[model samples]
Target: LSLSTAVKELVENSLDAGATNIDLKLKDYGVDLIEVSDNGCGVEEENFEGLTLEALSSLCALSDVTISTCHASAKVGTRLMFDHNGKIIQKTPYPRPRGTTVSVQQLFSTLPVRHKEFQRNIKKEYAKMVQVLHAYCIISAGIRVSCTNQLEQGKRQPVVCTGGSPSIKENIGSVFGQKQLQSLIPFVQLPPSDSVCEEYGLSCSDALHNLFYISGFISQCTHGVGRSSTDRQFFFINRRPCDPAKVCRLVNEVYHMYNRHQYPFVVLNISVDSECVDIQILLQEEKLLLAVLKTSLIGMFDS
Candidate 1:
């Protein structure tokens, strides 16, 4: 996996742990090290072996893994260092605040060609990492998330930082700047999906009847002086970030109604009932879900 994908998974794991504050740091564009620390309930000692097994199985070329976690007592913590293969090399009692810090070092070092290729696109990789971080920050509004480039001197350059506000609008301001937030049209609606179709003069069948909620922001017009790029568009299904192309295409078609070719800024989040949705199958169920949502979204503007 790429650095951004790996980090995204790690951040999601932290969220699953109920972390209020999450800090991600990278050294040498994460070619040297990537460290993620979270102020959440620490992993228990019994689960340490399983943790190593899972992480090591997935991640290749990881040179070192250091885990520091505080158990029941908040006074101190246990620090353990493991080799690339997940064998514990060192274990010691350390002074630390409550929480966990997982540091992954020397990424892709096992494969020289992979390492060299990654090193060549250091700047590009870092940019992608920042973009990924920003997306997560917007979706996970209330979490205090911060990512920094550790290579910079003095005060490290912060890529993204959210104020931990529950409001999605506030989080948008943090990622896209306060000015960009003004162009957003807040779209919030609950669905069994009838009123929207009626307004749009469209008929809905049984397939269009599984949406639970849809709430997010779409651009009022083309952002700024020039045509906006599709990079600004985001889709989160059940609070997990994903790129649903059909949904994106549907939104784009809606945009074409107002502007000929310009893309609009969109952060569309949708939730569907469990019985109607099967996330395990990649394209099949998702396409059906998007079809239902697409009609509802188009109707919002059509009316």
Candidate 2:
């Protein structure tokens, strides 16, 4: 795991709290600090202490951590200090709004091996954080997410910011670029060819034959239509971002056949009948579904 994994997990935690506004900050590209804040449901005492204990052990680094938060039933907020080993050093009574601010300082202090990696790999790590953060920003409509970065010199601006847009396309437009927006067509209804569907155990005569529905934005498949790289290809299963290798590459494979120079900017969310395929439904339908998706996606490129 890299910086993307760390930042993404925290952002997910904020979203899980039903927070509408999330602020992510980094100093020296996450070398000095990595912080995330949200005005969502604040945790009771043990929520974060138990979490940091479990998650921080993987790296065996990070010198200090602090949390300022207030829960629904509280009159005053609590500020807790954490040492490198996730030990609570002190707790101070603080005045704060109903939000949580978790910040880390002095990264890789305990691990010399990892600190060495930081000097060499920081740019890559910063880019990854930006890349993965882009997907989160675009996919989360009505969620105002801001990421600010600062150097030791301290001059910068917001990397990702949306004051909360209602339309998914609007979020994509503003976050990426309005120019990138013009090239993409939103919510182009796609057809799942019935033959593949029938083969996948989807009964033709059944009422719920359309077991899976994909509703998201994708690029218009023209020669200059896609991105410089596969940076923006995002896929989600029921709103949970997934890096299912086959499906991602499969889409690219199909797209390259149509336009070999570039890749599609696809942000698709597949909604399946939960009870029908909750456990191993995807397992059984994996092959069937891939074939079906490929068939339709190719059709999109052709016309």
Candidate 3:
């Protein structure tokens, strides 16, 4: 996996483990080292070795890695490291609380071209990494997340931190500040009543085709437009961040009709029925699904 994908998956794994606080440490713009430590339920000794092995097997271009886990049932934490050949290099006892920390060093070193490309524009890549971290933080409301550069001193330069508040509005405020948050119009979905459906040329059978609901905020006209690009728009299917260009384009089309020359800022979360969705062809199905969702959103504003 690429560095970006690896970061995302590792964060997701922490969330899946019920982590409340996720701390990510990036050294040398994540070219030399990347560390993800979580205050989640630590791995049990019985399952620790297998899981660590599995993770190591999945990754490539890694010189060294270690797993430090403190289980609730154990008195002390166990630290295990694997050699370049993927064999157990060392296992020692350590003291720590109930949590886990996985550290990878010299990542992507085996691929010379990729390593060179990443080292070329260090700042640009760091910006991308911060952008990704912000996206996840915004979507996940009640998780305390932070990313720091270990190279810096005195409060660590460009440190980004978020409070674990359950309120999406508060969390959004933390990331983009109050001004951008205020410009957003809270988007919600509701069941269409019989009279409303009749007025909108929608029948019960027509509505039955819709097997999903969409909800999230969109920017109001007073918020102003983005310059030259609409990069703020995000589409999430089943709580996983994804890009559906057609769906995003539809949002722009509908918004531009009323607010000419202005682009829309949207963070759309879609919850769909498993039976009606094929993940492999999610974008294909979105061709129609997005149309219906857009119409519904516009109708909400209209009527």
Superposed model 2: Cα runs more than 4 Å off: 46-53, 56-61, 187-191, 194-209, 273-283
Q: Give lDDT per model, in order.
A: 0.73, 0.75, 0.72
Clashing pairs for model 3 are: none
Best by TM-score: 2
Per-candidate TM-score against the hidden true structure: 0.86, 0.87, 0.85
Candidate 3 residues 1-303, lDDT tens each?
Answer: 456777787898788878989989877778778888998888788885577454554552254678788878888898988766566678899888788888888776766677787778767777766767777877888899988776634344456778998876676678778887766877766555555456556777766666667877777644253323575776777777777677777777767766677886777877786555565335434434654666655765553
Query: How high is the lDDT of residue 260 in model 2?
Result: 85
lDDT of 3 at 129: 68
Task: Flag regions of model 1 displaced more than 4 Å.
Answer: 73-75, 152-155, 190-208, 222-227, 279-303
**Mind sharing the TM-score for model 2?**
0.87
Better of 1 and 3 by lDDT: 1
Question: Candidates 2 and 3: which is better by lDDT?
Answer: 2
lDDT of 1 by residue, 184-245 (tens): 77774534255544644545564454455677888774435224577688777777777767
